[PDB]
Design an enzyme around this catalytic site. Structure first.
Site, mmCIF file in Angstrom:
data_model
loop_
_atom_site.group_PDB
_atom_site.id
_atom_site.type_symbol
_atom_site.label_atom_id
_atom_site.label_comp_id
_atom_site.label_asym_id
_atom_site.label_seq_id
_atom_site.Cartn_x
_atom_site.Cartn_y
_atom_site.Cartn_z
ATOM 1 N N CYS A 164 0.813 -1.217 0.000
ATOM 2 C CA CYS A 164 0.000 0.000 0.000
ATOM 3 C C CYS A 164 0.845 1.266 0.000
ATOM 4 C CB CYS A 164 -0.937 0.019 1.215
ATOM 5 S SG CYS A 164 -2.070 1.411 1.288
ATOM 6 N N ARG A 202 -0.034 4.575 2.948
ATOM 7 C CA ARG A 202 0.122 4.391 4.380
ATOM 8 C C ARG A 202 0.483 5.602 5.254
ATOM 9 N NH1 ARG A 202 4.069 -0.423 4.696
ATOM 10 N NH2 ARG A 202 4.471 0.029 2.470
ATOM 11 N N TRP A 245 -9.212 5.907 -0.613
ATOM 12 C CA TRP A 245 -9.575 6.645 -1.822
ATOM 13 C C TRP A 245 -8.575 6.292 -2.920
ATOM 14 C CZ3 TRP A 245 -8.622 9.372 2.818
ATOM 15 C CH2 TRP A 245 -7.291 9.831 2.975
ATOM 16 N N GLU A 290 -4.838 3.755 -10.760
ATOM 17 C CA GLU A 290 -5.517 2.474 -10.551
ATOM 18 C C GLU A 290 -6.686 2.313 -11.531
ATOM 19 O OE1 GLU A 290 -6.184 1.316 -6.132
ATOM 20 O OE2 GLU A 290 -5.838 3.480 -5.976
HETATM 21 C C1 HEM Z 1 -6.643 6.253 2.052
HETATM 22 C C2 HEM Z 1 -5.983 6.066 0.880
HETATM 23 C C3 HEM Z 1 -5.368 4.900 0.351
HETATM 24 C C4 HEM Z 1 -4.616 4.945 -0.796
HETATM 25 C C5 HEM Z 1 -4.366 6.179 -1.643
HETATM 26 C C6 HEM Z 1 -4.136 3.595 -1.026
HETATM 27 C C7 HEM Z 1 -3.460 3.164 -2.152
HETATM 28 C C8 HEM Z 1 -3.168 1.812 -2.501
HETATM 29 C C9 HEM Z 1 -2.705 1.348 -3.784
HETATM 30 C C10 HEM Z 1 -2.311 2.245 -4.948
HETATM 31 C C11 HEM Z 1 -2.605 -0.003 -3.744
HETATM 32 C C12 HEM Z 1 -2.408 -0.917 -4.912
HETATM 33 C C13 HEM Z 1 -3.823 -1.257 -5.413
HETATM 34 C C14 HEM Z 1 -3.825 -2.236 -6.577
HETATM 35 O O1 HEM Z 1 -2.855 -2.218 -7.376
HETATM 36 O O2 HEM Z 1 -4.805 -3.004 -6.695
HETATM 37 C C15 HEM Z 1 -2.918 -0.367 -2.413
HETATM 38 C C16 HEM Z 1 -2.817 -1.646 -1.904
HETATM 39 C C17 HEM Z 1 -3.187 -2.037 -0.626
HETATM 40 N N1 HEM Z 1 -3.613 -1.179 0.401
HETATM 41 FE FE1 HEM Z 1 -4.100 0.775 0.199
HETATM 42 N N2 HEM Z 1 -4.573 2.735 -0.021
HETATM 43 C C18 HEM Z 1 -5.321 3.503 0.812
HETATM 44 C C19 HEM Z 1 -5.967 2.968 1.925
HETATM 45 C C20 HEM Z 1 -5.876 1.668 2.452
HETATM 46 C C21 HEM Z 1 -6.488 1.252 3.663
HETATM 47 C C22 HEM Z 1 -7.426 2.100 4.522
HETATM 48 C C23 HEM Z 1 -5.994 -0.018 3.906
HETATM 49 C C24 HEM Z 1 -6.301 -0.917 4.944
HETATM 50 C C25 HEM Z 1 -6.844 -0.567 6.129
HETATM 51 C C26 HEM Z 1 -5.112 -0.340 2.837
HETATM 52 C C27 HEM Z 1 -4.481 -1.597 2.637
HETATM 53 C C28 HEM Z 1 -3.797 -1.994 1.499
HETATM 54 C C29 HEM Z 1 -3.474 -3.383 1.176
HETATM 55 C C30 HEM Z 1 -3.496 -4.571 2.179
HETATM 56 C C31 HEM Z 1 -3.119 -3.383 -0.154
HETATM 57 C C32 HEM Z 1 -2.719 -4.536 -1.060
HETATM 58 C C33 HEM Z 1 -4.011 -5.195 -1.510
HETATM 59 C C34 HEM Z 1 -3.778 -6.324 -2.488
HETATM 60 O O3 HEM Z 1 -2.814 -7.090 -2.274
HETATM 61 O O4 HEM Z 1 -4.559 -6.437 -3.455
HETATM 62 N N3 HEM Z 1 -5.074 0.684 1.932
HETATM 63 N N4 HEM Z 1 -3.353 0.735 -1.685
HETATM 64 N N1 LIG Z 2 -6.864 3.174 -3.322
HETATM 65 C C1 LIG Z 2 -7.349 2.003 -2.921
HETATM 66 N N2 LIG Z 2 -7.799 1.884 -1.677
HETATM 67 N N3 LIG Z 2 -7.378 0.963 -3.779
HETATM 68 C C2 LIG Z 2 -7.888 -0.399 -3.486
HETATM 69 C C3 LIG Z 2 -7.756 -1.345 -4.693
HETATM 70 C C4 LIG Z 2 -8.630 -0.857 -5.848
HETATM 71 C C5 LIG Z 2 -8.248 -1.401 -7.242
HETATM 72 N N4 LIG Z 2 -6.805 -1.137 -7.558
HETATM 73 C C6 LIG Z 2 -9.136 -0.748 -8.312
HETATM 74 O O1 LIG Z 2 -8.610 0.051 -9.118
HETATM 75 O O2 LIG Z 2 -10.356 -1.044 -8.338
#
Ligand code: HEM
Ligand SMILES: NC(=[NH2+])NCCC[C@H](N)C(=O)O
Ligand code: HEM
Ligand SMILES: C[C@H](O)[C@H](O)[C@H]1CNc2nc(N)[nH]c(=O)c2N1
Ligand SMILES: C[C@H](O)[C@H](O)[C@H]1CNc2nc(N)[nH]c(=O)c2N1
Ligand SMILES: NC(=[NH2+])NCCC[C@H](N)C(=O)O
Ligand SMILES: [Zn+2]
Lengths: 409, 411
Positions: free
Chosen positions: A108, A111, A280, A285
């Protein structure tokens, strides 16, 4: 022992010690790196150590390491385990665990916001209707009329594996995918199968290009049920370009709330199989992956056509020119409608700042380079030049089999 | 223990057994992945086994494994090693060795061409002037008037470590970099340190934005000497855009022949510390990295202005828009001047085919995803969606410390 990571664009060097507390495996070995591989019940004897690990870090985090309270709680949980063969987290622990699971999600990039997570304790839930209620509340709370707020709703922890709660959808909100006679696919190809399991359950599909799927909730082990999310609760953004008026004609739109719902939250050995969370979008993405992946909406050619670019030769970089425009459109639309969204430049800059904060306040920050670097303009974002060390810390979010490949009806 | 990689775009699954022959370490452990980390004299005791593994591989490749020729060769090398502490490769083994080091280079996306490598044997070279002559011949042959040919020149192997041959330049052809007293840098920032060394060695720098550096050559462990590559031998391409007439006014140009010259080639335990090799560019190397990296020429802003892009906020993606144009200009200029070059779509598509072929005919293809995936438009190229396994096979190309950091100056 003490590993160092360098940023080749700035020469800044961070030292990592946090990895030493790593507990899980990486898939890698000294003879092979599997860094690019997408996917590389507990007994009383397995459980207690995990609980101790967590409680020790939990109490250390609140400056009461080895306090009576620490020892007490440690003993109480101990007894509860030897007795119930399991335990329950206090609320203070559930919240700390969820936040830290996000804090530890090496894939992520968002973070820097980890400590602001809103946790909705749904451990008292017992039915699909109950789960549906909790989820609607989560969606409304997180959407917040476009001023998105991160959140996670935690359903009852696993027991015997035959009483697990599960949200069959991969994300709370996603578009349907149908395999047409043409052999081609209507809607979102990634959801072609789920779109069918719903129907296999009675869902009346409008067979459109952007049909919000129905929730398929599974509680206490029973078979899952369908529920349509109140349309008024699903914010959508119509995609238009800030120059190509024809853009609107492309008939494109996406949802504003990204909410991963198929993962498993692990806290102190306890496993939460239904823990949907949301934040968000980062622009790419949708614009790069969902819109341009060949196995997704695969819309590059059309956009290239409408732009009248020389698609005769790859070297004209039409796919590239179009990729940029499409992504400019997404960010423009969301912004125009005041829906929270972040561009990959700003998102990656924040992550670098967050890494530095984590290195100086925690001694490290597990990170998976392959996932952190955006799918476009990689090297012009700072994370591309940032060495990263990937390792697994707990609490954590883990992948888990699609329920339909495990459910005993 | 088999291992499978899947391509999430085509669902194609391949099985890797080749990694089983991997001996060198990766830098990773069961507890940590160092996959994105840039950089994670032998004795008789250790040499012969290395020589044997190599000879066994070579004789198998020629279908003469276990032959009398194979046994005699092992016996001969064995004797030669105990006798002189080292050994000399036959010409055939050297060519085979060089080609396989390329075949095994997990960070190279151009490997589909590995078997067509031209190998120049410069093991009889004894002086810096000799090195310069070999190098000039390599540049003319490889350049071939714009119709580039891959090649490698191999100088005498390391012996005691006090007589090493080294090419101090990091690439045979590269632009000088000059740090100004006002803090700005003129030319290529990547080569400032080396440029200083050249000036200190006597090079009279013209101090422009694209001065071709002189060769700084070290033969037999001696102090290095300077040499100017005949300008007529240095092919360059003025950069211009197919639709923006002002692009040419940025005054940009690049050399046509990329030739890494600072790596170490290991074959059968032998160490070739001076082994410059060259291929042809993939557009993004120049257009994305050399021109747009904040630490290289850093031209995004200037190109952004000329395009009158909204540079007020990053979400306008003005950097992304300008990046595409600059890369279009690079590909266009090269094709126009008929100088070999390959765009990233084409190169990655070719690598996927190469990879699949390798899995089928060889049981795998070690590949470093971090390096293989292009610096722009990652996911619209097929490599992004391709799972890869990275492991170290020999023969191989390795990094070595800059010689100015280890050399014992003689005076
Ligand atoms: C608030 C703004 C947030 C942004 C901008 C963000 C952004 C991202 C992005 C760009 C990815 C890659 C998504 C993909 O390629 O499918 C990702 C992965 C991930 N994020 Fe976030 N995230 C946010 C919030 C969260 C929250 C609130 C959590 C958990 C409480 C979280 C947990 C993770 C996890 C576990 C992954 C990997 C998921 C997977 O393996 O498919 N994220 N996030
Ligand atoms: N910014 C996030 N929380 N992304 C969660 C995964 C969403 C996914 N990559 C999509 O485009 O549908
Ligand atoms: C013929 C065309 C060739 C193309 C298009 C090609 C392409 C590439 C590219 C794009 C990279 C990344 C370079 C960077 O990011 O700095 C690379 C790296 C590499 N290639 Fe090639 N290559 C070619 C020929 C060769 C040859 C002839 C050899 C060896 C005989 C070779 C050995 C390597 C090595 C060892 C690396 C990694 C170098 C490093 O770690 O800095 N390549 N190649
Ligand atoms: C095979 C490869 O691991 C795969 O395509 C990865 C690459 N990097 C990624 N990075 C992010 N953020 N999301 C993804 O889905 C992927 N897919
Ligand atoms: C820190 C990170 O490993 C570094 O910036 C890498 C990433 N991928 C790369 N890929 C290629 N082809 N060339 C490079 O120099 C790099 N640099
Ligand atoms: N395709 C090649 N042979 N590349 C060799 C490395 C060139 C280096 N990346 C540069 O931009 O100058
Ligand atoms: Zn690894």
């Amino acid at each position: 022992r003490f590993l160092k990571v360098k940023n080749w664009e700035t020469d800044v060097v961070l030292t990592d010690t946090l990895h030493l507390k790593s507990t899980l495996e990486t898939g890698c070995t000294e003879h092979i790196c599997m860094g690019s591989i997408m996917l590389p019940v507990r007994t009383k004897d397995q459980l207690f150590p995990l609980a101790k690990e967590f409680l020790d870090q939990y109490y250390s985090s609140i400056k009461r390491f080895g306090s009576k309270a620490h020892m007490d709680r440690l003993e109480e949980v101990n007894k509860e385990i030897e007795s119930t063969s399991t335990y329950q987290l206090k609320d203070t622990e559930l919240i700390y665990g969820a936040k830290h699971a996000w804090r530890n999600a090496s894939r992520c990039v968002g973070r820097i916001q980890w400590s602001k997570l809103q946790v909705f304790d749904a451990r008292d839930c017992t039915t699909a209707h109950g789960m549906f209620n909790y989820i609607c509340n989560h969606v409304k709370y997180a959407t917040n009329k476009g001023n998105l707020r991160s959140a996670i709703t935690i359903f009852p922890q696993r027991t015997d594996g035959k009483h697990d709660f599960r949200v069959w959808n991969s994300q709370l909100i996603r578009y349907a995918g149908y395999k047409q006679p043409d052999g081609s696919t209507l809607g979102d190809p990634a959801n072609v199968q789920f779109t069918e399991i719903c129907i296999q359950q009675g869902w009346k599909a409008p067979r459109g290009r952007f049909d919000v799927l129905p929730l398929l909730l599974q509680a206490n082990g029973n078979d899952p049920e369908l529920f349509q999310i109140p349309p008024e609760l699903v914010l959508e953004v119509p995609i238009r370009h800030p120059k190509f008026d024809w853009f609107k004609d492309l008939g494109l739109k996406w949802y504003g709330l990204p909410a991963v719902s198929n993962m498993l939250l692990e806290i102190g050995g306890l496993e939460f199989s239904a823990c949907p969370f949301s934040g968000w979008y980062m622009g790419t993405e949708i614009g790069v992956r969902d819109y341009c992946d060949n196995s997704r909406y695969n819309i590059l050619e059309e956009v290239a056509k409408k732009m009248d670019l020389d698609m005769r030769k790859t070297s004209s970089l039409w796919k590239d020119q179009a990729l940029v425009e499409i992504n400019i459109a997404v960010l423009y639309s969301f912004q125009s409608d005041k829906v929270t969204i972040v561009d990959h430049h700003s998102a990656t800059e924040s992550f670098i700042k967050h890494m530095e904060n984590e290195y100086r306040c925690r001694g490290g920050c597990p990170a998976d380079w392959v996932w952190i670097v955006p799918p476009m303009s990689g090297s012009i974002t700072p994370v591309f030049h940032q060495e990263m060390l990937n390792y697994r810390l707990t609490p954590s979010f883990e992948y888990q089999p699609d329920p339909w490949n495990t459910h005993v009806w």
